[PDB]
């Protein structure tokens, strides 16, 4: 069956240092919508690797309060680049 | 790599008819919060079935601006049945 754990962290952004994953998604689909977020790779040394919670292929779902669903790519890298502690939740399906 | 479709769709109830489709998980995790909600099956014959856009592993990420992440399963019943006759549902199909 279906799984889907709800991966839920806070990063400390570090002066000189960025948080260390890439995003992919979030396109247009045909009916209006916007596709899903994923975190598509992570740096090996990194803020968001050494916490180690996030993964690649983790859907994003929120970042500080704002939801990543719905929403277009350009939004969700403007939200990430936004104070010193990002509270990211996401899932990650098995 | 990871593509994701967002499934948006309001459906109607039927006097004498259920939704027509079960849920799976919502379930406790050692870290406190409550694992993602997806539809488990849909009644061959019924308003999601005959609405086509959901579909059995899809997960449920907003139901009439209640959001299903990190919500415990009793609680996602009971808002699918405490939900009037108009149910928008917001979702995402993993491919």
């Not at 709800?6 to 998604?25: A, D, M, P, V, Y």
């Not at 309060?65 to 939004?75: A, K, L, Y």
Request: positive net charge; without cysteine.
């Amino acid at each position: 069956g279906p799984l889907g754990s709800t991966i839920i962290t806070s990063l400390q952004r570090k002066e000189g240092h960025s948080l260390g994953f890439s995003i992919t998604g979030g396109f247009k689909q045909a009916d209006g919508q916007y596709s899903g977020i994923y975190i598509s790779k992570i740096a090996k040394d990194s803020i968001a690797a050494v916490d180690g919670k996030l993964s690649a292929g983790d859907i994003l779902l929120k970042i500080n309060d704002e939801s990543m669903t719905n929403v277009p790519h350009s939004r969700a890298v403007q939200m990430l680049r936004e104070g010193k502690i990002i509270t990211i939740v996401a899932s990650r399906q098995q």
